[PDB]
Design a binder for this molecule. Structure first.
Ligand SMILES: *[C@@H]1O[C@H](CO)[C@@H](O[C@@H]2O[C@H](CO)[C@@H](O)[C@H](O)[C@H]2NC(C)=O)[C@H](O)[C@H]1NC(C)=O
Ligand SMILES: *[C@@H]1O[C@H](CO)[C@@H](O[C@@H]2O[C@H](CO)[C@@H](O)[C@H](O)[C@H]2NC(C)=O)[C@H](O)[C@H]1NC(C)=O
Lengths: 47, 48, 49
């Protein structure tokens, strides 16, 4: 509806090469009144 | 190693677009007519 | 009007006259590329249709 939102969690893990089987919910974080057409996104890792 | 994201629909200054980035001094969030790099990333000097 | 209207016509106030589909609520469109009204493809700054 023209508003962009973020939710997050951080947690400690000990698994070598795959996403850990378990359950935990994410809290909300931000709201951003951008009002723009988004159809794609792109991640910035550092080199 | 993750720092953030682009979001948009043309990414080459034809339509306004969103930049989100957690850089070494602060987070920045900005909505502008950006011309993005062909391969956006944040470069780090790391020498021995 | 008593502030805004210019005797020669205040041509600094414009509205988007054509669009291919209706916009979603609270969407802003800054794309001013030439509206292909006809069945023709159309390119450059101008053309018939
Ligand atoms: C948001 O931007 C995209 C990209 O311009 C639009 O997606 C296009 O929609 C029309 C539908 O007739 C097609 O001609 C294009 O081929 C579509 N492109 C893609 C990449 O899907 C989208 O319609 C725009 N949203 C709004 C609300 O106008
Ligand atoms: C992270 O990116 C932001 C945005 O480009 C940088 O913020 C600028 O910082 C300088 C120095 O403090 C100021 O002169 C500018 O006015 C800031 N710009 C804005 C939009 O606030 C920030 O410096 C970058 N971090 C690093 C480590 O370079």
């Amino acid at each position: 509806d023209g508003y962009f939102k973020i939710y997050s969690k951080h947690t400690p893990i000990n698994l070598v090469r795959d996403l850990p089987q378990g359950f935990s919910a994410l809290e909300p974080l931000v709201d951003l009144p951008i009002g723009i057409n988004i159809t794609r996104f792109q991640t910035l890792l550092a080199l | 190693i993750i720092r953030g994201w682009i979001f948009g629909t043309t990414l080459d200054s034809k339509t306004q677009s969103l930049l989100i980035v957690n850089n070494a001094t602060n987070v920045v969030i900005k909505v502008c007519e950006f011309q993005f790099c062909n391969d956006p990333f944040l470069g780090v000097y790391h020498k021995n | 009007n008593n502030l805004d209207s210019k005797v020669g016509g205040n041509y600094n106030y414009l509205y988007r006259l054509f669009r291919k589909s209706n916009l979603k609520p609270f969407e802003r469109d800054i794309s001013t590329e030439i509206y292909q009204a006809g069945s023709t493809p159309c390119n450059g700054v101008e053309g018939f249709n």
